[PDB]
Design a binder for this molecule. Structure first.
Ligand code: NI
Length: 341
């Protein structure tokens, strides 16, 4: 059944709750972003109101064929009334179109639902600074101190410098980047920019990217593989067998692959700096796992929460095991005693 951490008390609302059938007493279904664990259940047969960003609404219409009459896109950073309740959508610094949702309940309670987010100090100057938040529905994906990772900027600098060096040493090298969802577009777009190439991809992935309102996108991507030396493939294909196979397909245009797997966290982060990352190599194929995250590190999460000073925290991730739940509640208490709220 629908878990309690997907329901907004004092409203008829749910968040990211499309796989439970008709939720009893739900008058408006919000969707924070277009990732499959969150939209699971949506289709052209859905007939309840869906509230979301403009970008998420483009993907619902074009990818899932949700009918236009049930898509209610809202502008960001704008007070809006939904079924009698004031709400605001805020940028979540996750994937394109991802939002956090502020609910102003009739009784005076204010609730923030982060959806999935990568906490950032810039959020401390949004509409969140203007009033007290009582309850926080928090993306706790990486809520443990072992999870450190570099800035997105450091990671993109590494990728750009690696790719440009490799292709300038060997102009017959192909660059390949893995993907299995929206998000992390900076990785492949920054590499293609430095190389003076468009990114080549399947018709399905090109359609997905054309829903994202990215400026000048027609100048950066293409379905013509042959004209491109940065290719995007399913993340599943980013292994030696899959890559050897792909290289056969390019008909001797290329004699080397350099491939990127933008993972979340990996335990090489506990030891190794970004400067010191090395690839796995077999023959003329090299694969780099780069720690490009669209979720908060432990320290970024902690800073956001100690700034916001909520009265109650409800985790939305890692909630399935008692040991995970108890660990997270211990960190919450540490943060509160350290900061004095
Ligand atoms: Ni997500």
């Amino acid at each position: 059944t629908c878990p309690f951490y997907k329901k907004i008390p004092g409203t008829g609302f749910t968040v990211d709750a499309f796989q439970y059938g008709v939720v009893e007493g739900c008058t408006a279904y919000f969707l924070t972003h277009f990732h499959s664990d969150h939209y699971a259940g949506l289709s052209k047969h859905f007939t309840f109101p869906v509230y979301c960003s403009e970008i998420t609404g483009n993907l619902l219409k074009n990818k899932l064929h949700v009918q236009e009459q049930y898509i209610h896109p809202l502008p960001l950073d704008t007070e809006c009334i939904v079924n009698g309740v004031k709400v605001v959508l805020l940028d979540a610094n996750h994937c394109p179109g991802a939002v956090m949702i502020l609910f102003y309940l009739p009784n005076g309670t204010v609730i923030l639902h982060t959806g999935d987010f990568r906490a950032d100090p810039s959020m401390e100057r949004s509409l969140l600074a203007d009033q007290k938040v009582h309850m926080l529905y928090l993306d706790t994906t990486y809520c443990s101190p072992e999870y450190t990772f570099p800035s997105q900027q450091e990671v993109i600098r590494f990728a750009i410098n690696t790719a440009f060096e490799a292709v300038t040493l060997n102009p017959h090298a192909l660059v390949v980047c893995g993907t299995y969802s929206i998000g992390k577009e900076k990785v492949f777009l920054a590499i293609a920019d430095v190389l003076g190439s468009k990114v080549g991809m399947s018709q399905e992935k090109y359609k997905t990217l054309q829903c994202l309102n990215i400026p000048e996108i027609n100048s950066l991507i293409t379905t013509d593989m042959c004209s491109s030396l940065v290719h995007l493939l399913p993340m599943m294909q980013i292994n030696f067998k899959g890559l050897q196979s792909h290289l056969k397909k390019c008909g001797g245009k290329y004699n080397q692959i350099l491939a990127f797997r933008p993972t979340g966290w990996t335990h090489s982060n506990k030891f190794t700096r970004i400067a010191d990352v090395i690839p796995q190599t077999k023959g003329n194929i090299s694969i780099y796992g780069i720690p490009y995250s669209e979720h908060s590190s432990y320290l970024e999460m902690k800073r956001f929460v100690q700034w916001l000073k909520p009265q109650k925290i409800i985790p939305t991730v890692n909630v399935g095991t008692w040991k995970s739940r108890s660990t997270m509640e211990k960190y919450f208490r540490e943060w509160k005693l350290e900061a004095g709220y």
